[PDB]
Amino acid sequence: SPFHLNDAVAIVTGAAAGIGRAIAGTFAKAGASVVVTDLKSEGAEAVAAAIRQAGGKAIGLECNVTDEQHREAVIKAALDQFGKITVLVNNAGGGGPKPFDMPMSDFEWAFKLNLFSLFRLSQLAAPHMQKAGGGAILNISSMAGENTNVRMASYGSSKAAVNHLTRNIAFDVGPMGIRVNAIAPGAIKTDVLTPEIERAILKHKPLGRLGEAQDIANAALFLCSPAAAWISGQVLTVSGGGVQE
Amino acid sequence: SPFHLNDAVAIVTGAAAGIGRAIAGTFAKAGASVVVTDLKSEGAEAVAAAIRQAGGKAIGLECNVTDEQHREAVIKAALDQFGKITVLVNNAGGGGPKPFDMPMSDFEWAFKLNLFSLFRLSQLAAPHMQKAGGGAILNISSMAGENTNVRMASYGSSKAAVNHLTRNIAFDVGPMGIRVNAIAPGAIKTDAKPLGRLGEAQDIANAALFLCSPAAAWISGQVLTVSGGGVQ
């Protein structure tokens, strides 16, 4: 069964909660040694200790993925703690709806947070992955990278930048033995509202349920595992079929 | 015929040469008063003077599109000279192949030059386009926005951001009366199959004129590739 992460060392950012937490928890149970990072070191430490209590190996650290010193701290700590890096999951990000006339600083921040951070972290992890014999990068993008709506100027174009970054740099890092893929999560219910709101949403979901975080982490495990050794440069949309418009 | 630009006042950036020069001249002969800008003020002026000499209405200015003072001045200049803004052609841009391990400034700069500049120029022009009753924004993107290859981390993803910017801000400025479209040029005979000749800047200018004319009053959020069919 190739859906394992035996002997892997995986960095998973923004993983105090939600999708990143599920990813780190699933990656440890699949055999990876997980370096959990978050804006708050407390949240990343809770997850890492849940992993250790459950029988895996993990450390949590504070990391602001937009500050270059923190990024190098995470790389050094992972290598100090586990001797190598072979898997990088860029789950950290943010943004959302903003009017067309937003401040430039708002627009530019969607890119510092959603794009430049993961790109530099891929730059930083890549040489260690290659020295390690190979590895896998995963970008948690978003469906706004593909969809077209009002109030999406910064959030949507930054996520499209991420999707296409994914496609293109799989060419550059392939010969280092690295694959690069992305997941575009859909409507995931995070640990929300009334049973009448959900029932009406679920009239427009083909599978008639929202997602869970474990749905995305299952797809993350898939794409970073040897079971996806021939998959690189793909954006994989995990959204239960979409939404009837 | 709706394939004209009478009643239009068109800002055209990076237009001292190549595709942008072709767009500026073509917009003028189709009847638009053109505000030509370029990084080099003299190149902008040369184009404007030739337009006027050929019977059009235009002026030329220096504009480094990444400079908020320069952007503001270009808006001010279209209003002072021609009284209105209806068309914005974001052709200024740059970049190209770069190693994956490029300095972070090269990666970031391709976004300030290719993306943040136009978006800000779009914010500036939009109130005047609404006030004038409507208008058209046209972004000159690149085939690298949808293609994939080595050495394209910065250039390709910034052009992808331009593409999807175009698709989404069509929603925001539609209610203002503004349409937004992009062109990806391809296989063009930069002075730098279906014919017995390569692409020409004029081919791109003809597409740009269509996408900015009343003949495209019902086209918004599209990315039109103009490359002779070569794609993927």
Q: Where are the alpha helices (DSSP H) in A36-116?
A: 41-53, 68-82, 104-111
Q: What share of chain A is helix, strand, coil (3-state, %, to 5)?
A: 50, 15, 35
Q: Does A160 touch chain B (CB under 8 A)?
A: yes
Q: What share of chain B is helix, strand, coil (3-state, %, to 5)?
A: 45, 15, 35
Residues written for chain B: 232
The CATH superfamily holding the domain A9-237 is: NAD(P)-binding Rossmann-like Domain (3.40.50.720)
Is residue B58 within 8 Å of residue B42, measured between CB atoms? Answer: no
Is residue A238 within 8 Å of residue A217, measured between CB atoms? Answer: no
Of the candidates B126, B145, B153, which has its C-beta nearest A172's C-beta?
A: B153
Of A155, A160, A225, A239, the active-site residue reads: A155
B9-226: which CATH topology? Rossmann fold (3.40.50)
Is residue A144 within 8 Å of residue A151, measured between CB atoms? Answer: no
Residue B195 is a catalytic residue: no
Say how far apart CA B156 and CA B159 lie, in whole Å: 5
**Domains of chain B by residue range:** 9-226
B116:A108 CB<8 A = yes
Method used to obtain the model: X-ray
Say how far apart CA B94 and CA B226 lie, in whole Å: 19
In the numeric block, the tokens 């009284």 are attached to B83
Q: If we measure between CA atoms, which residue out of B18, B16, B42, B124 comes closest to residue B34?
A: B16
A172:B100 CB<8 A = yes
Q: Does A111 touch chain B (CB under 8 A)?
A: yes
User: Which residue in B112, B165, B232 has the most chain A C-beta atoms within 10 A of its own C-beta, making it the best mutation to test that interface?
Assistant: B165
Buried b (16+ CB within 10 A) or exposed e, A71-86: bebbbebbeeebebbb
The two tokens of residue B67 are: 């400079």
